[PDB]
RNA sequence: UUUUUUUACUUAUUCAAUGAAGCGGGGCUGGACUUGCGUCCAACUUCUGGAGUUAAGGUCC
């Protein structure tokens, strides 16, 4: 059963999202880490499509994004469903070394050796995990290829270890906008 | 701080001082980290590599022979 | 059916007025004997 | 004496079908003029089998199968509710109420005769050994036949010792002193 | 392909056949005496005729109105020990610098609770809304309270959970709570809740509160009476 | 507070509500043991005027005697 | 059999045609629904008529939803009698 | 019992009381340390520092393995960071005392042999790659082993630093650590 | 509104039995009558002084 208050709340959420998206559309290179968090249950088609291209379907999925004008517009569009910021070298290194998976043959392959990187990105001069880290962190010419090779990171929920807060989501919605260097606390807690 | 090495049973029982069971066939205590031989090197000598290759090859031959024998019996 | 429509209306009214937590689990007991439970000593 | 002479407790098997038992021993019960029969039934709820003690009807023998229940046949030794027998049938150990495991017609050579049935109110009219007429619920049980050991009282006891042997295990007051042989302080007949 | 040596051995659970399986026998469990007593107490209260002053406590707020009432009332929970200690520290500092405690402490707006306190508030008409728990034992403590609120013109509602009211007032249980005054940013919400209570509980229970309760038959007695009425109608 | 109302209501022992409560409580106390501990007084105003306090160290025991 | 018309008033901002249909389809099948709106601006006037196919289904929905406190509004849910139903109500 | 009290506070809606009682739980996800203190157990299980130095092979292999693992519920991320910190402190002691003797590059990892107070200590470190947590191991019992070994290595590090007259724990620079200093984020200076 | 009579009921009270095991009401199947489908009545073991207990199996993972 669905409540009438749920229906009214969903309409007001959609009207607020429509007003915000219309304002963004009327208004019209760094590295950011973006984590999908829980937000509004009903998502408009344009934020849904932006999550499609950003590979942020499941909760606690993390991706690396090069900051351009188009990507900044996409991030501003999907701000109510993401937590994003500037990752440091320790965060990038730990993410790639501990939760690093590549997409070869459409399959998820853990980065257990430099040979996978050599046969998947060796045409771009990337022959090792450290070359991949260098491309991601310095945002090189082949950042798109490196980030597309990297599978979205599956980050863990720290609340699962404690029984009284077992169902609680780690990142609560509401703190919109860039977290800047404070995304590294979330990455350190969840990685 | 705390710097160690410097009615409740304040002494441990000798059953605790008894050594643990070893699963090795000779009954002796296996080291926690065994000493690696030359055949396990990433760039090993030719003699050690050939010795390891010969041992694993004859083991594989024996295993496949036994497997085919049991398949024929079945 | 008319009875099915009436039952659906009753179910919707009950869910609106009292909620959706209508059911409860009870222990299956294969014996008629109740033992005092063992607690911490 | 080891056990009282009672029917099985009125359970589901006797209420709806029949359960078979086997007569193992026919034994002498001290203080009772009638023999007892040890009958073993199965437990319908566990692997162990149950030993019962019945008053033995005449014609019962060791190794004989007997049947207790609503759907049991009309044979000597079988235990049936009174609604399951026709008029004119004599029975032993007839329950006064369904479930008290036998009250009427228990001594040697005695029985209870089913005079009639009132099926509307579920009652049965029976004739007792004293000649009395009684009405019992039709679900009351009884064992088909006459209690064994009949004709016991025909033989004269002939001896004070035989009377003493009879009453020593029966606990009855023996010898009996007449009240007229007593003093006026001992008996109202005294003097 | 399956092994030909595997065999099906069905069991027959008819009378005189194989041993019965282990079924759920919870309906016939020999319960402990305290469980049996509390269940039979509930059943006896269902069986007897309940006078209307007790029977009116079977009508409570529904889920939506109870949730709205608690949504308002959770903004007005009383002071905790830590909050009171901090307030007393601020007042002590103000006294030390030579200012009154009312200079640094504002007027509080809390949920009024405690049975004698709330009864006095109702008698002096200071209470604007009264919520009475439906499960007070002994019931004589709150049996007169609907009549008192009706005589003094106070809106009241019977609500489920003295433990639920205890969560409001930082106790294990609370027999009754009352709202006298709220803040100006919640005056409209308080007026709307009072009007919702008046229109959706009191008018709906205006006639049922005067009726006798209980008098319900058991399952087997109900089936026996239905069979008897069917037999009488057929014959 | 409410204890004045409780005293006035306890005066009316032949009223319908008090008779119903007496009947159900008589059945319950007959089901319980001859002497048993009560968690709280069943007549709080009567206990309070006889000297009971809701303080650690005051207990209530219920007892039935053959009349 | 006979359809039943429910008149609902004091609607809050957000309880419009889609939400009303989705909510009351849980109670029963809805054949017609309309929200009283002004033609000048298109805004709702906090009133609606929902005619279900089934009369006591409509009665049950009205009795359930009457005096429901929803977003600071106390809903009004009455049953329009078949004698007083406008033949051009659901145009 | 404390977890029951926290559940009661959360169920009643006392968020401040729940947080205050949760501060007494000493959760590893918050502290980086084991939930239960094993300091008294360490002395009982190693009567002598020589016994501890003889168990250092298993201790160092386990901790150097777990410093490269992802965060789980058994071993949280702050625990893994503390394991890495202890391994770095031990490596700094080995550097300043020149106790490292042999190193080997095998097909399974890097073997290190050091000599501390006349005892030969050999431990195996994985290559820096993604490590596979397979289902054939009992990972939670491995986590309990990790808690014990991290408790042991803390005391061993303190004893060695005090023996060579250095303050313990060494100064740690979080800014350089977040920039990626690893071993370089430690500053070693003498005692008093 | 009350007094008498009988005439039902169950919840007080009383009795009995059991290891508190199959009660009450429906469903399925079969048989009878009935109206042209409602009742009631039945499911299950009877040549033999054997044996019967740790679920076989089916189907989704």
């Amino acid at each position: 059963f669905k409540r009438a208050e749920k229906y009214v709340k969903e309409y007001r959420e959609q009207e607020r999202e429509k007003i915000r998206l219309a304002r963004i559309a009327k208004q019209q290179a760094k590295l950011v880490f973006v984590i999908r968090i829980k937000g509004i249950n009903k998502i408009p088609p344009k934020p849904r499509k932006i999550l499609q291209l950003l590979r942020l379907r499941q909760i606690n999925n993390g991706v690396f994004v090069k900051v351009t004008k188009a990507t900044a517009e996409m991030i501003k569009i999907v701000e109510p469903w993401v937590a994003y910021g500037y990752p440091n070298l320790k965060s990038v290194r730990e993410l790639i070394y501990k939760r690093g998976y590549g997409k070869v043959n459409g399959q998820r392959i853990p980065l257990t050796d430099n040979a996978i990187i050599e046969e998947n990105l060796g045409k771009y001069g990337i022959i090792c995990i450290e070359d991949l880290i260098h491309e991601i962190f310095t945002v090189g010419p082949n950042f798109k290829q490196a980030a597309n090779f990297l599978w979205p990171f599956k980050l863990s929920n720290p609340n699962g270890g404690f029984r009284p807060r077992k169902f609680k989501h780690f990142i609560e919605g509401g703190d919109l906008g860039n977290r800047e260097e404070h995304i590294n606390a979330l990455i350190r807690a969840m990685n | 701080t705390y710097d160690p090495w410097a009615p409740d049973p304040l002494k441990k029982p000798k059953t605790l001082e008894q050594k643990p069971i070893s699963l090795a066939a000779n009954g002796k205590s296996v080291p926690a980290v065994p000493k690696p031989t030359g055949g396990y090197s990433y760039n090993p000598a030719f003699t050690d590599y050939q010795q390891r290759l010969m041992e694993e090859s004859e083991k594989a031959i024996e295993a496949e022979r036994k497997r085919l024998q049991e398949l024929e019996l079945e | 059916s008319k009875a099915a429509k009436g039952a659906q209306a009753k179910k919707a009214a009950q869910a609106a007025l009292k909620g959706v937590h209508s059911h409860k689990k009870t222990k299956v007991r294969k014996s008629t004997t109740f033992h005092r439970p063992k607690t911490l000593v | 004496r080891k056990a009282p002479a009672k029917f099985r407790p009125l359970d589901y098997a006797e209420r709806h079908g029949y359960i078979r038992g086997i007569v193992k021993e026919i034994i002498h019960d001290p203080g009772r003029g009638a023999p007892l029969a040890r009958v073993v039934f199965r437990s319908p709820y566990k692997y162990k089998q149950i030993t019962e003690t019945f008053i033995a009807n005449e014609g019962m023998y060791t190794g004989q199968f007997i049947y207790a229940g609503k759907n049991a046949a009309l044979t000597v030794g079988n235990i049936l509710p009174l609604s399951s027998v026709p008029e004119g049938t004599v029975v032993s150990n007839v329950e006064e109420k369904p479930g008290d495991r036998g009250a009427l017609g228990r001594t040697s050579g005695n029985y209870v005769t089913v005079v009639g049935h009132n099926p509307d109110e579920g009652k049965t009219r029976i004739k007792l050994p004293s000649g009395a007429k009684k009405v019992v619920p039709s679900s009351s049980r009884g064992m088909i036949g006459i209690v064994a050991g009949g004709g016991r009282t025909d033989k004269p006891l002939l001896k004070a010792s035989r009377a003493k042997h009879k009453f020593a295990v029966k606990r009855n007051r023996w010898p009996k002193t007449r009240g007229v042989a007593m003093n006026p302080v001992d008996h109202p007949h005294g003097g | 392909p399956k092994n030909p040596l595997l065999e099906k051995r069905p069991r027959n659970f008819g009378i005189g056949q194989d041993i019965q399986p282990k079924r759920n026998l919870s309906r016939m469990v020999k319960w402990p005496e305290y469980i049996r007593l509390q269940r039979q107490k509930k059943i006896l209260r269902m069986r007897l005729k309940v006078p209307p002053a007790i029977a009116q406590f079977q009508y409570t707020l529904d889920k939506n109105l109870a949730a709205q009432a608690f949504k308002l009332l959770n903004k007005y929970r009383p002071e905790t020990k830590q909050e009171k200690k901090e307030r007393l520290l601020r007042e002590a500092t103000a006294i030390k610098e030579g200012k009154k405690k009312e200079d640094v402490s504002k007027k509080p707006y809390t949920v009024k609770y405690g049975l004698n306190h709330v009864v006095g508030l109702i008698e002096n008409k200071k209470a604007s809304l009264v919520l009475i728990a439906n499960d007070v034992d002994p019931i004589e403590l709150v049996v007169f309270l609907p009549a008192l609120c009706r005589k003094m013109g106070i809106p009241y509602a019977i609500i489920k959970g003295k433990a639920r009211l205890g969560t409001l007032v930082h106790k294990k249980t609370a027999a009754v709570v009352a709202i006298t005054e709220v803040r100006s940013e919640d005056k409209n919400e308080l007026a709307k809740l009072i009007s919702a209570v008046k229109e959706g509980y009191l008018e709906k229970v205006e006639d049922t509160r005067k009726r006798w309760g209980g008098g319900i038959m058991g399952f087997k007695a109900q089936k026996r009476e239905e069979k008897r009425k069917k037999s009488l109608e057929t014959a | 507070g409410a204890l004045k109302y409780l005293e006035e209501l306890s005066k009316k022992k032949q009223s319908d509500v008090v008779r119903f409560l007496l009947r159900v409580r008589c059945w319950e106390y007959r089901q319980l043991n001859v002497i048993h501990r009560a968690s709280r007084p069943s007549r709080p105003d009567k206990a309070r005027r006889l000297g009971y306090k809701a303080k650690q160290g005051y207990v209530i025991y219920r007892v039935r005697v053959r009349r | 059999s006979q359809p039943g018309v429910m008149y609902i008033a004091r609607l809050p901002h957000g309880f419009y045609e889609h939400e009303l249909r989705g909510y009351f389809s849980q109670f029963g099948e809805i054949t017609r629904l309309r929200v009283v709106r002004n033609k000048k601006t298109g805004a709702s006037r906090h009133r609606a008529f929902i005619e279900f196919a089934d009369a006591e289904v409509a009665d049950i929905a009205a009795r359930t939803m009457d005096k429901y406190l929803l977003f600071g509004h106390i809903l009004t849910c009455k049953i329009v009698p078949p004698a007083q139903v406008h033949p051009d109500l659901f145009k | 019992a404390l977890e029951k009290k926290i559940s009661r506070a959360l169920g009643r809606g006392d968020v401040s009381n729940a947080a205050r009682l949760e501060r007494n739980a000493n959760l590893p996800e918050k502290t980086g340390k084991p939930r239960y203190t094993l300091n008294h157990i360490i002395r009982e299980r190693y009567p002598t520092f020589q016994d501890a130095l003889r168990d250092l092979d298993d201790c160092l292999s386990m901790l150097f393995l777990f410093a490269n693992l992802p965060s789980t519920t058994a071993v949280p991320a702050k625990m893994i960071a503390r394991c890495e910190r202890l391994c770095h402190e031990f490596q700094h002691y080995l550097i300043v005392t020149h106790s490292l003797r042999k190193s080997f590059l095998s097909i399974k990892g890097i073997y290190y042999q050091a000599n501390i107070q006349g005892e030969d200590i050999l431990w195996l470190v994985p290559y820096k790659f993604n490590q596979r947590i397979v289902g054939d191991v009992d990972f939670r019992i491995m986590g309990t082993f990790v808690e014990f070994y991290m408790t042991l290595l803390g005391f061993v590090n303190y004893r060695l630093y005090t023996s060579i007259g250095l303050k313990y724990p060494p100064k740690f620079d979080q800014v350089k650590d977040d920039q990626g200093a690893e071993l370089a984020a430690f500053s070693l200076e003498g005692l008093n």
Side-chain angles (χ1 to χ4, degrees), chain A, chain B, chain C, chain D residues 1 3-191, chain E residues 1-231 235, chain F, chain G residues 3-37 42-91, chain H residues 1-191:
Chain A
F1 183 79
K2 192 172 168 186
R3 328 267 307 169
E5 51 262 21
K6 194 158 198 172
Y7 276 102
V8 174
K9 171 196 182 179
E10 280 176 349
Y11 176 107
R12 298 191 180 184
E13 282 169 338
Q14 297 312 270
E15 93 177 353
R16 281 202 241 90
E17 266 304 311
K18 178 179 176 175
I19 272 155
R20 185 188 67 95
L21 287 184
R23 179 193 334 310
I24 281 171
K26 176 252 317 163
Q27 193 268 314
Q28 275 289 326
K30 289 193 178 180
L31 163 68
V32 283
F33 194 71
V34 186
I35 316 175
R36 170 75 147 86
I37 69 175
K38 187 181 183 180
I40 304 308
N41 287 353
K42 176 62 186 180
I43 306 178
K46 177 180 227 33
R48 258 214 281 100
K49 190 180 185 60
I50 293 193
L51 292 187
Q52 216 46 6
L53 304 321
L54 286 211
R55 309 181 296 167
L56 292 169
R57 319 280 293 281
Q58 303 61 12
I59 318 292
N60 310 333
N61 280 19
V63 286
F64 287 115
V65 166
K66 167 181 192 170
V67 182
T68 64
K69 289 327 110 162
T71 48
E73 280 323 81
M74 302 162 84
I75 285 175
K76 285 298 294 315
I77 282 174
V78 296
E79 258 188 352
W81 298 272
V82 303
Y84 74 100
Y86 306 136
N88 51 40
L89 189 55
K90 189 194 187 185
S91 280
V92 173
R93 165 155 293 113
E94 282 193 348
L95 274 166
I96 292 177
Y97 272 129
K98 295 178 169 174
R99 294 189 190 266
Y101 292 79
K103 182 177 183 177
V104 337
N105 295 331
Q107 300 317 42
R108 212 167 96 104
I109 306 302
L111 306 179
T112 52
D113 46 90
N114 294 322
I116 302 160
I117 287 106
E118 196 166 2
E119 328 304 333
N120 287 273
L121 295 173
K123 69 189 69 176
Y124 310 114
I126 304 175
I127 61 178
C128 59
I129 302 194
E130 226 51 58
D131 273 330
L132 186 75
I133 291 180
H134 170 80
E135 203 81 12
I136 292 296
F137 190 67
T138 63
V139 197
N142 305 139
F143 182 86
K144 169 191 179 181
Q145 282 69 87
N148 260 23
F149 173 69
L150 278 172
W151 202 272
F153 300 92
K154 317 285 184 175
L155 314 169
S156 68
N157 189 7
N159 289 338
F162 202 43
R163 207 191 173 283
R165 310 188 275 97
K166 196 176 60 181
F167 303 104
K168 185 184 180 181
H169 281 255
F170 188 63
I171 309 169
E172 301 93 354
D175 187 23
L176 311 209
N178 209 321
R179 299 165 184 265
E180 296 182 349
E181 75 276 346
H182 297 271
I183 200 61
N184 294 289
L186 293 181
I187 295 165
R188 206 68 68 247
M190 300 200 301
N191 178 36
Chain B
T1 176
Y2 184 178
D3 178 322
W5 313 290
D8 277 19
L10 266 75
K11 55 192 49 61
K12 298 165 55 176
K14 30 176 171 93
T15 45
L16 270 190
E17 307 160 354
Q18 303 271 326
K19 63 168 187 179
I21 301 173
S22 172
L23 287 191
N26 40 352
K28 311 170 184 178
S29 64
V30 180
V33 183
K35 265 190 208 53
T37 89
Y40 279 80
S41 168
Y42 94 107
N43 187 19
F46 174 78
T47 36
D48 309 44
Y49 188 67
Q50 283 304 312
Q51 174 66 32
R52 281 210 67 208
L53 199 61
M54 260 54 260
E55 293 182 23
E56 302 297 328
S57 294
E58 58 95 4
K59 270 179 58 49
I61 296 325
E62 263 318 292
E64 189 80 3
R65 216 205 40 81
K66 265 198 51 57
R67 193 190 62 92
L68 292 183
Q69 172 178 357
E70 309 302 327
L71 226 64
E72 274 313 286
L73 286 183
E74 174 82 9
Chain C
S1 173
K2 197 174 190 180
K5 294 167 183 179
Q8 204 224 345
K10 302 335 167 106
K11 193 61 209 222
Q14 163 183 120
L17 289 178
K18 289 180 58 61
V20 295
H21 296 95
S22 52
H23 274 67
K24 182 186 254 289
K25 272 184 171 170
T26 32
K27 290 184 186 178
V28 168
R29 298 178 194 262
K30 291 158 170 357
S31 174
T32 48
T33 297
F34 196 95
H35 281 283
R36 185 218 268 137
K38 296 157 181 174
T39 50
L40 172 58
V41 173
Chain D
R1 302 174 196 173
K6 298 179 171 179
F7 287 158
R8 314 169 70 256
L10 188 47
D11 55 348
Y12 178 89
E14 288 212 44
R15 275 188 270 108
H16 304 270
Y18 60 87
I19 184 178
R20 190 183 76 173
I22 174 176
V23 184
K24 314 274 270 224
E25 334 176 53
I26 297 183
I27 64 178
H28 169 93
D29 199 36
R32 188 191 310 272
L36 299 187
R38 289 222 224 270
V39 185
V40 180
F41 295 86
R42 282 194 90 203
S43 179
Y45 314 106
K46 68 192 172 181
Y47 175 55
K48 197 185 180 67
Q49 296 202 14
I50 309 170
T51 306
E52 300 283 341
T53 310
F54 300 154
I55 287 167
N57 273 1
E58 216 206 91
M60 278 178 46
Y61 60 96
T62 48
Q64 178 190 2
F65 289 129
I66 64 169
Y67 302 84
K70 177 194 182 183
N71 294 344
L74 201 91
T75 307
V76 159
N78 279 11
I79 303 172
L80 282 79
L82 290 196
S83 62
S84 263
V85 310
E87 298 92 323
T89 307
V90 314
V91 280
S92 67
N93 200 44
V94 188
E95 305 184 298
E96 256 155 344
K97 298 223 225 293
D100 73 288
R101 296 170 105 189
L104 319 168
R106 293 170 55 91
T107 69
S108 73
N110 275 310
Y111 51 89
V112 164
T113 311
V114 179
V115 185
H117 295 102
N118 322 335
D120 304 357
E121 42 281 3
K123 299 311 227 318
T124 297
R125 302 183 314 280
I126 55 174
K127 204 230 280 213
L128 295 180
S130 69
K133 297 293 195 307
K134 202 168 185 168
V135 178
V136 291
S138 286
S139 261
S140 286
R141 292 172 296 175
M143 169 188 271
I144 314 290
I146 307 175
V147 177
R152 178 176 39 86
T153 53
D154 301 344
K155 185 183 182 179
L157 284 165
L158 214 63
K159 278 162 75 183
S161 75
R162 290 196 189 166
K164 185 185 177 66
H165 280 301
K166 171 176 183 184
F167 291 122
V169 80
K170 284 168 125 25
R171 101 164 61 246
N172 302 4
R173 193 234 304 172
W174 197 93
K176 298 143 177 306
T177 325
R178 291 173 290 118
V180 282
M182 320 204 165
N183 291 119
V185 86
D186 286 324
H187 207 268
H189 288 38
Chain E
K2 265 154 175 181
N3 209 319
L5 303 172
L6 303 177
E7 276 305 284
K8 313 186 194 311
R9 315 199 280 279
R11 286 172 177 167
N12 212 297
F13 299 132
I15 298 176
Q17 270 152 301
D18 315 326
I19 304 162
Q20 293 308 303
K22 291 281 185 173
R23 294 180 175 94
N24 191 4
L25 308 185
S26 69
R27 197 189 75 85
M28 316 168 273
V29 153
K30 194 180 180 185
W31 294 102
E33 287 180 343
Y34 84 102
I35 290 155
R36 175 153 68 254
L37 175 64
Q38 69 180 11
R39 288 177 180 172
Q40 285 179 12
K41 185 159 74 163
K42 172 79 179 300
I43 288 173
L44 181 70
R45 270 151 168 85
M46 277 194 317
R47 295 290 158 265
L48 300 184
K49 287 189 66 230
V50 185
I54 301 177
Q56 58 169 329
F57 284 86
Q58 302 286 120
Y59 311 98
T60 59
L61 289 189
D62 78 330
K63 168 176 166 52
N64 175 67
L65 197 45
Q68 289 333 113
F70 272 81
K71 190 165 304 174
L72 175 58
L73 262 63
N74 272 318
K75 309 177 184 178
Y76 290 90
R77 292 156 85 108
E79 223 180 18
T80 73
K81 298 185 36 184
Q82 302 45 42
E83 290 163 347
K84 175 156 182 167
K85 273 151 177 179
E86 293 156 359
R87 178 179 63 83
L88 287 189
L89 281 178
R90 295 190 243 108
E91 291 178 359
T93 55
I95 289 298
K96 173 202 59 180
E97 328 172 350
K99 295 177 297 178
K100 261 78 182 43
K101 59 193 208 243
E102 295 87 8
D103 313 348
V104 317
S105 293
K106 289 318 115 203
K107 177 185 181 59
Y109 303 81
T110 78
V111 168
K112 308 297 187 168
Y113 65 102
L115 179 55
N116 298 321
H117 181 220
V118 168
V119 155
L121 287 155
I122 294 161
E123 287 173 341
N124 310 351
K125 313 189 72 175
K126 270 166 194 115
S128 96
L129 180 59
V130 174
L131 302 182
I132 315 167
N134 73 318
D135 46 348
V136 176
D137 197 320
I139 195 59
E140 293 99 320
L141 293 156
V142 297
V143 70
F144 67 98
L145 262 202
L148 185 57
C149 291
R150 285 163 59 79
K151 227 167 94 175
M152 312 283 318
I154 313 294
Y156 74 97
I158 301 181
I159 206 155
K160 283 181 170 196
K162 54 183 178 180
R164 214 185 173 186
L165 301 186
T167 57
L168 272 172
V169 297
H170 306 307
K171 304 291 172 294
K172 282 184 298 189
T173 45
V176 60
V177 297
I179 291 291
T180 64
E181 299 177 334
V182 297
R183 304 172 200 102
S184 40
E185 76 259 9
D186 292 313
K187 282 221 213 71
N188 179 72
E189 184 180 2
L190 175 62
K192 201 41 95 188
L193 177 67
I194 278 177
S195 156
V197 162
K198 279 180 170 178
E199 298 182 26
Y201 175 64
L202 290 164
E203 297 171 13
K204 297 195 181 177
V205 309
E206 184 69 31
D207 286 340
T208 63
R209 70 178 297 272
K210 278 172 304 182
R211 260 136 49 171
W212 281 70
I216 314 166
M217 270 198 305
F219 188 85
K220 295 178 180 184
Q222 240 176 252
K223 289 302 180 291
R224 252 130 45 188
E225 206 87 309
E226 287 173 5
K227 232 156 227 194
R228 214 152 90 150
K229 290 331 110 164
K230 177 149 286 329
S231 300
Chain F
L3 298 191
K4 187 58 178 161
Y5 296 91
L6 260 70
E7 182 223 309
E8 258 51 65
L9 189 62
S10 301
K11 284 178 178 177
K12 319 298 159 191
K13 286 186 182 69
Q14 315 221 42
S15 74
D16 283 356
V17 48
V18 180
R19 261 163 45 94
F20 174 80
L21 286 173
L22 277 172
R23 193 182 177 193
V24 294
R25 279 168 208 167
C26 205
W27 174 83
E28 184 194 352
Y29 302 156
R30 199 161 55 243
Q31 298 316 117
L32 283 167
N33 274 0
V34 163
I35 295 175
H36 60 275
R37 163 142 196 195
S39 69
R40 66 188 67 246
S42 75
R43 307 179 55 199
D45 72 301
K46 181 67 187 197
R48 182 153 303 267
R49 89 178 52 103
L50 285 184
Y52 177 82
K53 305 270 291 173
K55 168 184 296 189
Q56 278 161 331
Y58 288 84
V59 322
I60 300 287
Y61 260 75
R62 196 176 291 121
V63 50
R64 76 175 184 261
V65 293
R66 274 177 181 264
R67 53 189 307 205
Chain G
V5 185
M6 195 189 96
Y7 163 68
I8 181 170
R10 316 266 201 81
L11 292 169
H13 163 69
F15 224 3
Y16 297 139
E17 322 65 14
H18 284 346
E19 298 77 359
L20 282 181
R21 219 181 248 279
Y23 184 73
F24 286 103
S25 293
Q26 296 174 119
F27 285 83
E29 184 260 353
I30 298 171
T31 95
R32 268 129 74 180
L33 183 169
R34 71 164 290 219
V35 179
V36 177
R37 292 184 177 270
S44 159
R45 308 273 47 190
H46 315 277
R47 287 144 139 100
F49 292 90
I50 308 163
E51 159 262 341
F52 303 86
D54 206 66
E56 82 309 355
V57 167
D59 159 60
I60 284 163
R63 281 188 299 160
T64 307
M65 284 339 267
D66 186 55
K67 300 310 164 59
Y68 195 91
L69 177 53
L70 183 66
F71 281 82
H73 293 70
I74 302 163
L75 300 181
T76 279
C77 297
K78 321 286 124 194
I79 283 318
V80 202
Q84 278 75 42
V85 53
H86 205 277
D88 307 336
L89 193 37
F90 288 98
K91 165 194 174 186
Chain H
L2 180 58
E3 283 185 355
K4 275 171 186 181
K5 294 193 196 300
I6 296 160
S7 291
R8 200 195 91 134
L10 285 171
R12 293 182 43 90
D14 318 337
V15 283
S16 325
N17 265 338
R20 180 193 50 81
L21 294 155
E22 191 173 334
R23 283 195 287 273
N24 308 341
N26 318 314
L27 290 176
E29 310 91 27
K30 192 250 314 205
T31 69
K33 301 184 141 274
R35 176 89 174 265
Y36 304 97
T37 303
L38 312 170
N39 298 353
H40 59 289
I41 292 193
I42 290 300
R43 181 54 205 268
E44 157 208 326
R45 285 220 54 202
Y46 303 105
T48 59
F49 190 59
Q50 284 74 44
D51 292 324
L53 291 175
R54 281 188 276 267
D55 232 39
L56 266 198
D57 303 23
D58 219 358
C59 167
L60 289 159
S61 291
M62 270 294 270
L63 290 192
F64 267 100
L65 167 65
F66 262 73
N68 295 334
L69 289 186
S71 167
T72 64
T73 52
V75 186
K78 211 147 177 42
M79 218 178 237
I80 295 174
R82 176 147 177 79
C83 290
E84 208 185 356
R85 175 97 69 100
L86 290 164
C87 289
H88 284 335
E89 290 165 351
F90 185 76
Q91 278 181 333
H92 268 301
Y93 168 79
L94 291 176
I95 287 171
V96 301
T97 53
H98 302 284
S99 308
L100 180 63
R101 299 284 163 258
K102 302 295 180 186
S103 196
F104 183 48
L105 292 157
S106 74
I107 56 177
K108 314 164 53 191
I110 312 180
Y111 285 89
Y112 294 110
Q113 199 200 33
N115 191 273
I116 299 182
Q117 301 185 5
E119 299 280 348
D120 273 351
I121 300 167
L122 177 75
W123 73 101
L124 173 60
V125 176
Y127 289 108
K128 193 75 154 309
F129 286 121
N130 204 300
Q131 300 298 307
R132 305 313 300 151
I133 306 175
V134 300
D136 320 59
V137 310
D138 201 346
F139 193 75
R140 298 186 286 208
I141 213 79
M142 294 285 93
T144 73
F145 269 110
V146 163
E147 297 171 60
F148 178 81
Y149 281 142
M150 89 192 288
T151 306
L152 170 70
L153 193 63
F155 288 125
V156 163
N157 275 355
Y158 177 79
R159 167 113 166 176
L160 292 172
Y161 272 61
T162 320
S163 83
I164 66 162
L166 291 186
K167 47 87 190 193
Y168 188 80
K171 204 206 145 303
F172 183 76
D173 206 345
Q174 213 87 36
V175 179
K176 314 224 299 303
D177 182 62
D178 282 283
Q179 290 163 354
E182 301 169 359
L183 263 181
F186 290 81
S187 305
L188 267 60
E189 70 255 2
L191 195 50

